[PDB]
Symmetry: D2
Subunit: 461 residues, 4 copies
């Protein structure tokens, strides 16, 4: 008689379970943590509020936390990223989950609230797992008393880490956090190679457009921009890259990309005259990867080549000025998460109009919105880190400290390199890779232990 959930269709659970069983075989680091810690139950007594894309991969994360002793209440961190069969399998296992693909904004907020409240009252949560900081922000702003019981937050992604660091700087962060993003087995695995796999995947599923031979503009060249540019270049696109960071721009040049700005002299003065119209008029596909606001702006959208594809793979949809397109242009749905935006006006459209753009997932995370996000074998790294971060903070019991001790303990830290290397070794073995063991003389020669860590903390890989 379990009813503490809300999903699109519970009858998808058997399908979800079949895909979970396959996904476990693709996630050796995560499944390895089940075997290594199950006897010790390190999360016994943990009550975790979780807010992250309710995919099949997240299902294996959830059931790992539960297998190690935790109770959880779960929601997705995006309105389009849930896989309904994954949400169904989790609910059918008796786990509170509130998530479906295609939520409204109101339903999204309601879903997070259903994790926070149990039977109309605040749940006795003591841990937080977040992707983007939305759950973290709601707790700090609307339920601050609950944070007096919480031992820590483990944050998945670059945008959420920024929000944590803002609070730490302002002295408004109430509990310590682990920056899971900046494990190398996360940032340089998930953010880069994950988007390499899943960006062209989502574009093909949404449009079935040939990419070879066509012109792309990628805004940003951090980890997501690097992986996105490679996703397109390996398909044969001619990829140009925009950046505000000269070091990242240098990498794009050395990686074989032309570095350009949407704006003359790179100066974004807000006018149509600033736009390089010759450049924008040649672009078949624009992808935003920045975590910044309005990097594909109204004047760029006006200048784009007819029938260009526009999408965003950064965390939030304000990278693209979709508000401008809602106010001024008519949207024609092709199929779910694919809209033609007719630049002829707002008052309806000609079905045979040639002057439109194609927007994917309404500007939301395109790899999760139009496909299934990163593959299991990549998310294995990210989620093995999440499990270790949950154990790490839960075992330190910050919430039980007096205030003076809490102040000394309050931090936003990454996991130690030894754990990063432990995750990596399990990933490598999953590929059948064989790591070489240093001899004693060799370890002494380069100044490391045979067991690692093999690099100083300054190392960038």
């Amino acid at each position: 008689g379990f009813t503490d959930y809300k999903v699109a269709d519970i009858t998808l659970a058997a399908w979800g379970r079949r895909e979970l069983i396959i996904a476990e075989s693709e996630m050796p680091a995560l499944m390895g943590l089940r075997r290594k810690y199950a006897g010790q139950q390190p999360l016994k007594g943990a009550k975790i509020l979780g807010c992250i894309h309710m995919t099949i991969q997240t299902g294996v994360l959830i059931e790992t936390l539960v297998a190690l002793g935790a109770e959880v209440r779960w929601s997705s961190c995006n309105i389009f990223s849930t896989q309904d069969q994954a949400a169904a399998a989790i609910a059918a296992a008796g786990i509170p989950v509130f998530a479906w693909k295609g939520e409204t904004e109101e339903e999204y907020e309601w879903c997070i609230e259903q994790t926070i409240l149990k039977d109309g009252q605040p749940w006795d949560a003591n841990m937080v797992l977040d992707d983007g900081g939305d759950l973290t922000e709601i707790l700090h702003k609307k339920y601050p008393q609950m944070l007096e019981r919480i031992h820590g937050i483990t944050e998945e992604t670059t945008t959420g880490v920024h929000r944590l660091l803002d609070m730490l700087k302002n002295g408004t962060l109430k509990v310590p956090a682990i920056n899971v993003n900046d494990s190398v087995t996360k940032s340089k695995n998930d953010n880069k190679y994950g988007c390499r796999h899943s960006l062209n995947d989502a574009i093909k599923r949404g449009t079935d457009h040939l990419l070879s031979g066509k012109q792309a503009l990628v805004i940003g060249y951090g980890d997501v921009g690097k992986g996105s540019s490679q996703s397109l270049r390996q398909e044969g696109m001619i990829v140009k890259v925009a950046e505000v960071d000269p070091i990242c721009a240098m990498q794009a040049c050395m990686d074989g990309f032309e570095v350009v700005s949407p704006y003359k002299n790179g100066i974004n003065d807000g006018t149509e005259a600033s736009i390089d119209a010759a450049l924008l008029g040649k672009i078949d596909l624009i992808v935003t990867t920045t975590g910044n606001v309005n990097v594909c702006d109204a004047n760029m959208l006006k200048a784009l080549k007819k029938r260009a594809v526009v999408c965003n793979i950064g965390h939030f949809d304000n990278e693209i000025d979709t508000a401008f397109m809602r106010k001024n242009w008519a949207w024609e749905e092709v199929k779910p998460q694919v809209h033609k935006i007719h630049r002829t006006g707002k008052d309806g459209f000609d079905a045979h109009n040639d002057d439109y753009l194609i927007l994917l997932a309404e500007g939301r995370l395109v790899n999760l919105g139009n496909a299934t996000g990163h593959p299991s074998r990549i998310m294995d790294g990210s989620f093995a880190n999440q499990v270790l971060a949950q154990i790490h903070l839960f075992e330190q019991k910050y919430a039980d400290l007096p205030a003076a001790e809490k102040a000394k303990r309050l931090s936003v830290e990454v996991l130690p390199k030894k754990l990063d290397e432990e995750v990596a070794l399990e990933m490598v073995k999953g590929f059948g890779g064989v790591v070489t063991q240093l001899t004693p003389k060799q370890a002494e020669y380069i100044g490391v232990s045979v067991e690692g860590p093999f690099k100083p903390d300054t190392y960038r890989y």
Copy 2:
């Protein structure tokens, strides 16, 4: 030429050719020439006396003349016996700059050349700055001329191996002057160490052997910055590349980058026995490249097990990555041409000229890109050497040797340049490609919590 005799180079008559190539290189090095124009008037290195030890290439020539143009006097040697470009050395000597370097030095001559920079007219020069690549000059100063370090304000160290040696001295309390780790600027490590080897590894293998690489099997030992660039140098030519690593994080990157990760040893266990060698794997390898900065990562038993006619080379800083001593002791060497030897595994005394059981060793195991070609191209070295100039300016202006003891104790460290300067070097490199960097709006800068002028990333950022 003229009364100036304070140099030793292979052939001073190569100077005009060297000057022609320097003028071309200047056009390829906008960050370095940007610093030359920016600081020429202020002469920030006026009074600096720099001992320099780094590959005497055309690129180093532009570095040397930038330091001199900013006011420094220098005395120079190469940090490798095979890396000098003789026309570069000739052009520098012809400019009146003391340089002791030629391609193909003996080990004794290599040491002599470093000492000729340290000594002027039989007595220590009044040096007050050090620029080093690998730590050889740093070590000679600390061991044999410790009194000279009393007047030296800092060391600017180019490469990973040299930085490791500096950090060991700092931990032991034996480092006498502060240093800047030039290697770990992003416009150095993630430009020079990676993309430089991408350009110059397959370059050197082609010049030495003219072997087709496409379709052949390679084993790259290591997947740090040099191993990453080296693996790409070979894969982009169509080699089937396998990668060995001891670091599981670097091994993970190799897998995701599309390489098979293997070990020369069964189950990765290097117990010193021949039985531990994966002979089936090594018997398929046409090319092995060492990239580690470690010792004996291509060992005797690996060399015995390699496929006949395999090429063996090293692109790490020191030749002890390969057990060439084993090969000198046991096998007959046949020089094909300079820096290319066939190593006949049939025995030590003489060889059959038509023997099929040989390996081809490049540069006698020394840095192959510089030994068999010309190292990294000017436009890549632009980044490394702009950082060197900025590092020399910073430490010279700090004047460590003149500070009170309490201030010395606070500044005796190994530091990197601030990220703002890394970004400023990068911006000039991007402009050199014709790239255009976008300026954040005030609102966008506020949104991500940076200044419009940068820095754009926290110091934790790995790029």
Copy 3:
């Protein structure tokens, strides 16, 4: 008004299909240029075309181009899994007879072809054939030979179908001439190669969502499909090994940077388990067949494959993989449509948590069309512009109206002239925004060509 001469999965998908056709038209400039160039001339007026080819959105644009040029058609798919149901619905809603849906049974597949051949229970007065793989051509020759007396020609899309035509020609059983559409360069070296480059990894991702980077693939074949397939996987970071029986194609694989291996020790396939390179196959995470041949992923290979390997076929017919052996001996667990786990533990049921299974895509049928949407519109533009030109040419030649003595002189399998191949290519290049340079008169004389082409001798291989 009362149109019932069709059978599709769901007619209410038509509006969706029409939205996708309107998009595809903007992606197919060569085909739409033919529609615009020839519509007023109506060169296919009087043509009655039996068509058998994957009922995709791309085929919809082809169908409506033929109709726009004056043809009547009756259509079926050439594979049980390749139809896009919204494309079929849009074509039926346009009043065009189409019999096609995704997930046909073999009996339904044959019934659909027969529904194009028969109209109101009697042979339609067809006079042209468009085919992809030769199934319709075979049924006509075997079961409706009297209909071929009135047919002017066959335009055949794919390598396997052309092989079947040439077999009939050498045996003296081919009844009407054909155009080999496959061997236009804007077909074979566009569709067969780059199309599979686009759609192979596409279909694997949609079926399994497996990471491909870092994993080991074996591609059987290195012809045009094998070349494009190998690139589809290598560009994702797979470690790709290639098998071939043709030493020239094997040479290309080596030079392209692949290791060339055989499933069999020393390449010798003696039919025993002992001849299988068990060490090699035990490392393979994905095997793809691309040959047009029979049993190139055989029962002993399937027994030796690494646990949880993915098995798929992108050649025309499913007999490249011995799926019959898997049906007879192993238990099939459906993951979702066109994705099956095949449990090698036995035939009578399976442990839901068994680790010893293979993942088979599309039941061994063409995987790019079965698990995704096949080639993209802008690639199919080239193939289908060639189809329209081939239909025009054979229809205008009117073979069926010739005396028997003249039929014998005209009975052949031919390709389109290079000048038309070039004209298709030029529209494709313009579609990318590319600008082709024009020779000066002196340059044209220097290399011995006309300024307008053709630019290459017929021997040229590109």
Copy 4:
């Protein structure tokens, strides 16, 4: 006391021989033919005039022909392509060779005539091996009586095949020829992959320029243009391709290149107004690959970005208008086969002038002029075909046949596919590749012999 030769330096012979011994291990198809036919001596009595780049690879071909029974007299087919240590080794073996790197044009003709003449009179030659048609043309125009005794020509390269087909079309070809170029193990091996290996090799040796991140324009996308474009793209260049053949241009697009013209709308009207000056002003490297005339013309050279590199990898230097540059601009030699061309004027230059182009090999074949051309394991395919072609035409004995039988055989032909396959099989085994053998049922199913040929003659690979 052998003195029937002319080389730069005979003392380089020991070095040349060391490199020949290495090269033999890289050339299994050619050395397999040497071992296979040694007993038969199929070229006994053959007297071959040879004209092809005097490289180490050509040295292995020469000694294979001699090992099969031929006498030869040899010259290079380009003034810059000889490797002097290869020529010296061949001369020190007692084989007449007239070739050095850096011949003048007058010396080039002298070397060919030295092969044609022995002791001041025409040699009793009966076979021709040519690369580009220069020797073929001299024989037809200056020594026509010698062709009465010659059984055939085996021609290496696309440009020479074109010249043979023009002669045949005009009725002026006096002896039959084999088009060696169009074996698949030549055209789609040598012409493509050879240039992939050796184009960026030569640019690096000449200039040591970084290529990654810079802009290249490749003129042509036939086999040489395909291989050249890959040579630059794999280094990270942003490569644009020009073509007059829309089918080749289509391939360029699908292969991920932008297709552009030096001329506005592709129309070359001979004036500066027709040049796309914006495009050419951004180009760092131009490579001509066409076999055509004046495809990098004077107006393009005027418009190129300052300090652009200019080079040609087609057979003849007239692809670039070097005559215009000799007439109008000042040439500064950097080093052999590397010249700065100062666009400031004819009489002298400023040593610090910034307005120059860098020309490689004076517009001659750049891979052979500034490096060593294709590697041994690629030339293995081409030169195995050469040996088979020489055997076939010499055994046919055209010069001995009565006139009507000559008329049946006066043609330009290719080698049979079976032989193409057998060459390829030896190349594959050289990589350690394992070709699978068809079962009898499989061979019947696709309609081939288990032994091949495996493809119809129409097949394009």
